[PDB]
Design a protein around this motif. Structure first.
Motif, PDB file in Angstrom:
ATOM      1  N   UNK A   9       0.577  -1.209  -0.005  1.00  0.00           N
ATOM      2  CA  UNK A   9      -0.136   0.028  -0.201  1.00  0.00           C
ATOM      3  C   UNK A   9       0.786   1.368  -0.027  1.00  0.00           C
ATOM      4  N   UNK A  10       1.910   1.276   0.233  1.00  0.00           N
ATOM      5  CA  UNK A  10       3.077   2.348   0.217  1.00  0.00           C
ATOM      6  C   UNK A  10       3.480   2.715  -1.289  1.00  0.00           C
ATOM      7  N   UNK A  11       3.931   4.088  -1.283  1.00  0.00           N
ATOM      8  CA  UNK A  11       4.096   4.296  -2.841  1.00  0.00           C
ATOM      9  C   UNK A  11       5.599   4.477  -2.932  1.00  0.00           C
ATOM     10  N   UNK A  12       6.270   4.066  -3.994  1.00  0.00           N
ATOM     11  CA  UNK A  12       7.547   4.182  -3.991  1.00  0.00           C
ATOM     12  C   UNK A  12       8.129   4.950  -5.253  1.00  0.00           C
ATOM     13  N   UNK A  13       8.811   6.206  -4.982  1.00  0.00           N
ATOM     14  CA  UNK A  13       9.358   6.979  -5.977  1.00  0.00           C
ATOM     15  C   UNK A  13      10.103   6.504  -7.021  1.00  0.00           C
ATOM     16  N   UNK A  14       9.634   6.612  -8.290  1.00  0.00           N
ATOM     17  CA  UNK A  14      10.227   6.158  -9.389  1.00  0.00           C
ATOM     18  C   UNK A  14      11.791   6.137  -9.791  1.00  0.00           C
ATOM     19  N   UNK A  41      13.885   9.273  -2.720  1.00  0.00           N
ATOM     20  CA  UNK A  41      14.233   7.761  -2.788  1.00  0.00           C
ATOM     21  C   UNK A  41      15.953   7.584  -2.692  1.00  0.00           C
ATOM     22  N   UNK A  42      16.570   7.106  -1.687  1.00  0.00           N
ATOM     23  CA  UNK A  42      17.895   6.701  -1.584  1.00  0.00           C
ATOM     24  C   UNK A  42      18.059   5.304  -1.677  1.00  0.00           C
ATOM     25  N   UNK A  43      19.025   4.691  -2.399  1.00  0.00           N
ATOM     26  CA  UNK A  43      19.318   3.203  -2.257  1.00  0.00           C
ATOM     27  C   UNK A  43      20.646   2.896  -1.508  1.00  0.00           C
ATOM     28  N   UNK A  44      20.475   2.311  -0.493  1.00  0.00           N
ATOM     29  CA  UNK A  44      21.752   2.085   0.721  1.00  0.00           C
ATOM     30  C   UNK A  44      22.095   0.686   0.692  1.00  0.00           C
ATOM     31  N   UNK A  45      23.247   0.209   1.378  1.00  0.00           N
ATOM     32  CA  UNK A  45      23.678  -0.874   1.770  1.00  0.00           C
ATOM     33  C   UNK A  45      24.612  -0.989   2.763  1.00  0.00           C
ATOM     34  N   UNK A  73      11.829   7.970   1.144  1.00  0.00           N
ATOM     35  CA  UNK A  73      11.803   6.304   1.035  1.00  0.00           C
ATOM     36  C   UNK A  73      13.234   5.985   0.865  1.00  0.00           C
ATOM     37  N   UNK A  74      13.796   5.267   2.182  1.00  0.00           N
ATOM     38  CA  UNK A  74      14.882   4.940   2.223  1.00  0.00           C
ATOM     39  C   UNK A  74      14.991   3.452   2.129  1.00  0.00           C
ATOM     40  N   UNK A  75      16.115   2.920   1.373  1.00  0.00           N
ATOM     41  CA  UNK A  75      16.124   1.162   1.116  1.00  0.00           C
ATOM     42  C   UNK A  75      17.664   0.845   1.499  1.00  0.00           C
ATOM     43  N   UNK A  76      17.802  -0.250   2.407  1.00  0.00           N
ATOM     44  CA  UNK A  76      18.800  -0.795   2.489  1.00  0.00           C
ATOM     45  C   UNK A  76      18.872  -2.330   2.163  1.00  0.00           C
ATOM     46  N   UNK A  77      20.009  -2.986   2.351  1.00  0.00           N
ATOM     47  CA  UNK A  77      20.027  -4.290   1.968  1.00  0.00           C
ATOM     48  C   UNK A  77      20.703  -5.361   3.216  1.00  0.00           C
ATOM     49  N   UNK A  99      22.327   4.942   9.642  1.00  0.00           N
ATOM     50  CA  UNK A  99      21.384   5.807   8.894  1.00  0.00           C
ATOM     51  C   UNK A  99      20.711   6.822   9.930  1.00  0.00           C
ATOM     52  N   UNK A 100      20.675   6.395  11.220  1.00  0.00           N
ATOM     53  CA  UNK A 100      19.860   7.138  12.146  1.00  0.00           C
ATOM     54  C   UNK A 100      18.465   7.422  11.966  1.00  0.00           C
ATOM     55  N   UNK A 101      17.838   6.349  11.616  1.00  0.00           N
ATOM     56  CA  UNK A 101      16.186   6.158  11.363  1.00  0.00           C
ATOM     57  C   UNK A 101      15.895   5.026  12.303  1.00  0.00           C
ATOM     58  N   UNK A 102      14.444   5.169  12.677  1.00  0.00           N
ATOM     59  CA  UNK A 102      13.983   4.295  13.404  1.00  0.00           C
ATOM     60  C   UNK A 102      13.230   3.140  12.566  1.00  0.00           C
ATOM     61  N   UNK A 103      13.084   3.052  11.121  1.00  0.00           N
ATOM     62  CA  UNK A 103      12.457   2.261  10.301  1.00  0.00           C
ATOM     63  C   UNK A 103      12.930   2.417   9.034  1.00  0.00           C
ATOM     64  N   UNK A 104      13.039   1.460   8.410  1.00  0.00           N
ATOM     65  CA  UNK A 104      13.336   1.493   6.907  1.00  0.00           C
ATOM     66  C   UNK A 104      12.405   1.364   6.076  1.00  0.00           C
ATOM     67  N   UNK A 105      12.170   1.989   5.016  1.00  0.00           N
ATOM     68  CA  UNK A 105      10.763   1.691   4.030  1.00  0.00           C
ATOM     69  C   UNK A 105      10.773   0.243   3.373  1.00  0.00           C
ATOM     70  N   UNK A 106      11.841  -0.052   2.788  1.00  0.00           N
ATOM     71  CA  UNK A 106      12.294  -1.339   2.179  1.00  0.00           C
ATOM     72  C   UNK A 106      13.601  -1.815   2.536  1.00  0.00           C
ATOM     73  N   UNK A 107      13.436  -3.154   2.866  1.00  0.00           N
ATOM     74  CA  UNK A 107      14.746  -3.982   2.996  1.00  0.00           C
ATOM     75  C   UNK A 107      14.824  -5.187   2.408  1.00  0.00           C
TER      76      UNK A 107
END
Ligand SMILES: NC(=O)c1ccc[n+]([C@@H]2O[C@H](COP(=O)([O-])OP(=O)(O)OC[C@H]3O[C@@H](n4cnc5c(N)ncnc54)[C@H](OP(=O)(O)O)[C@@H]3O)[C@@H](O)[C@H]2O)c1
Ligand SMILES: C[As](C)(=O)[O-]
Length: 315
Positions: A9-14, A41-45, A73-77, A99-107
């Motif tokens: 249901x969430x929406x991801x920046x293209x 949207x930032x892609x991390x790992x 929208x913050x992504x890590x792996x 990352x100093x966040x309390x949740x990721x949007x996508x893992x």
């Protein structure tokens, strides 16, 4: 649009900003400029060894109130050395700290191959080969589903999985969360029509990585093909009065893919954002597709005999 709906249901920046090979000394500034310019949207790992420095930039822009956290929208792996059930929550919390966040949007599961746990990212035996974990894809998936039930991440996904490995998860007994996203390599030299068709038919969003051909990959060879310099692709760009990078970023967007070009250079970060204002024709698209030569930047060549190596299957 500028955002795609995920199965949660969430929406991801293209469009997002990639950070592989982005030096720790330059990436904080790079991510600060990206967010200013309009990236969300930032892609991390973890394996990129720059998440702390990425996180400094995110904190600064949140503190400044340039963006709210819910707009990002913050992504890590999860790296290959943490596939064991008991290591997964720990890897995640480490990334969250940096990352100093309390949740990721996508893992994402970074690769399907598990390695022996330890401090080395690629553990070698005495013969210099990579040491595998005996874990499998399904047990790692169950640990990832945990993370969603604990609030650490909103969505979970996979990366570099072939269609049979995706099948495997979709057929998992007691499957609780479907993968939201399969992040794969994709550009005019590796067009991925079969795997993209498969994932899209299953409600899995595809993210194209190395969209420009990764001209800064550390294993680059001088004979190697270059997308940014292909005269056929330069011609299409000239027709549209755009750069060849902007054409290469627009191409996956019109295939309904998320795309994550990497840059640490402020003018290129800006240039790469200006892709919402024009349209490749269907002739252009078919032409770019015809350039496929099944050429992969990232073939994980040290793991070609791992039981879970993804690239022996056709797609
Ligand atoms: N899941 C995976 O296994 C995986 C694997 C590979 C990549 N990815 C993700 O995908 C991201 C993108 O792939 P990538 O880093 O391989 O490469 P890329 O985005 O295909 O290319 C990055 C290279 O192209 C240059 N570049 C960027 N904009 C340019 C422009 N407008 N004109 C000319 N040159 C330009 C960059 O230079 P400057 O930085 O010097 O400006 C950098 O040298 C990665 O950073 C990572 O976040 C994931
Ligand atoms: C090429 As990589 C460091 O995203 O496995």
């Amino acid at each position: 649009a500028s955002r795609l709906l995920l199965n949660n249901g969430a929406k991801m920046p293209i469009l997002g900003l990639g950070t592989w090979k982005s030096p720790p000394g330059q990436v904080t500034e790079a991510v600060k400029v990206a967010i200013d310019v309009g990236y969300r949207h930032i892609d991390c790992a973890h394996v990129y060894q720059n998440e702390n420095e990425v996180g400094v930039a995110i904190q600064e822009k949140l503190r400044e109130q340039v963006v709210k956290r819910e707009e990002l929208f913050i992504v890590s792996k999860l790296w290959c050395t943490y596939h064991e059930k008991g290591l997964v929550k720990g890897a995640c919390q480490k990334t969250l700290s940096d990352l100093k966040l309390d949740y990721l949007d996508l893992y994402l599961i970074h690769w399907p191959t598990g390695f022996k746990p330890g401090k080395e990212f690629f553990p070698l035996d005495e013969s210099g080969n990579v040491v595998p974990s005996d874990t499998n894809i399904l047990d790692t998936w169950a640990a990832m589903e945990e993370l969603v039930d604990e609030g650490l991440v909103k969505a979970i996904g996979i990366s570099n999985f072939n269609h049979l490995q995706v099948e495997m998860i979709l057929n998992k007994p007691g499957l609780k969360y479907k993968p939201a996203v399969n992040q794969i390599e994709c550009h005019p030299y590796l067009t991925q029509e079969k795997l993209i068709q498969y994932c899209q038919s299953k409600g899995i969003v595809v993210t194209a990585y190395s969209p420009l051909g990764s001209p800064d990959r550390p294993w680059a060879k001088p004979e190697d093909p270059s997308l940014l310099e292909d005269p056929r692709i330069k011609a299409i760009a000239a027709k549209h009065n755009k750069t060849t990078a902007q054409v290469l970023i627009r191409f996956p967007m019109q295939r309904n893919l998320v795309v994550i070009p990497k840059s640490v250079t402020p003018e290129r970060i800006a240039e790469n954002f200006k892709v919402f204002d024009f349209e490749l024709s269907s002739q252009d698209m078919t032409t770019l597709l015809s350039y496929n030569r099944n050429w992969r930047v990232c073939a994980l060549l040290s793991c070609t005999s791992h039981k879970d190596y993804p690239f022996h299957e056709e797609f």
